[PDB]
Symmetry: C2
Subunit: 190 residues, 2 copies
């Protein structure tokens, strides 16, 4: 049925507004992460921003047109160091998957919008993993484990693919000469 | 010392030529992988192409100028199905890390170009992992394990970040509605 006049219609636009701002914030944090010498984290922020773009698109497509007024609170700033940005981002993700989306989903189910409710619940799953990544990286930074680990392991240069074996990433990639900032733990998800 | 007239100078340009063609081939294969419904593989081809761009840049920067003639054989085509493209790509990587770069490195050391020799040896390491990825993905396709596994595991939608738990990726992402093609095994390399 139509969304016109329902609380769900307002909630969808509210979610769209938040998703849109998150995309921008994450891209800015990605830029800051690059400046702070954290390439993997920078690319993660960029990827997360792209995924928020997709959450927003799905939501946007449910709308039926017209200008709708919404009342909502958003983070007024700010861009800080990468650790701080990761913490702030995780906090935003947390509110989304623990409070906002579950609430929007429940209201959607109550008003009879089952498909939309399932979408809100599904997006919440994505946001929870987004938070996990942000918290994990913040922890790595705080503990000084981004480029150094207890036992020897494999590190991959994101710039050229060079693989280094050791307790920590090298100061300079021996293949492409790019700085340590480009290294990440070698991952194999296949 | 100067590279002018050395065999290493020729080898560097030869490597640059091959690296350059590999970049194009991989980008084309990436496009084909997208058409075949393999998003993770498509992005891997694109990333690999970007890394070949960097191998080429490091090599290019060693050169001292002028037009140099080279004699070398290259793959004349072709673009086929993704499995075939992965196999062909792996074969190219194999020649590079088992024959070409080790030979270029040895000649470089013999002519007194230690830094360049180390770069050739280092690039070879990158190419070996490139091959591993290509062979692994080709095997997944051949065995029908790209989107389905024996035991239940976690699958991530590359488009929106949704996480699905089960033996296989869903036909449609419940969050962004994109097809199964966008799913990959959830990876955590940090
Ligand atoms: Fe989102
Ligand atoms: Fe998110
Ligand atoms: Fe590198
Ligand atoms: Fe290469
Ligand atoms: Fe390669
Ligand atoms: Fe999705």
């Amino acid at each position: 049925k139509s969304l016109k006049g329902s609380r769900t219609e307002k909630n969808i636009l509210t979610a769209f507004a938040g998703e849109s701002q998150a995309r921008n914030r994450y891209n800015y944090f990605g830029g800051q992460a690059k400046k702070d010498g954290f390439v993997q984290i920078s690319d993660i922020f960029a990827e997360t921003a792209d995924q928020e773009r997709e959450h927003a698109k799905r939501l946007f497509k449910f709308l039926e047109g017209g200008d709708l007024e919404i009342v909502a609170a958003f983070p007024a700033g700010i861009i800080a160091d990468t650790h701080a940005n990761l913490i702030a981002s995780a906090a935003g993700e947390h509110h989304e998957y623990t409070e906002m989306y579950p609430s929007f989903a429940r209201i959607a189910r109550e008003e009879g919008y089952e498909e939309i409710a399932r979408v809100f619940a599904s997006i919440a799953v994505a946001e929870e993993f987004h938070e996990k990544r942000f918290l994990d990286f913040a922890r790595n930074i705080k503990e000084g484990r981004v480029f150094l680990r207890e036992q020897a392991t494999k590190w991959r240069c994101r710039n050229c693919g060079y693989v280094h074996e050791g307790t920590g990433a090298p100061e300079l990639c021996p293949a492409c000469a790019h700085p340590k900032a480009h290294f990440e733990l070698l991952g194999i998800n296949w």
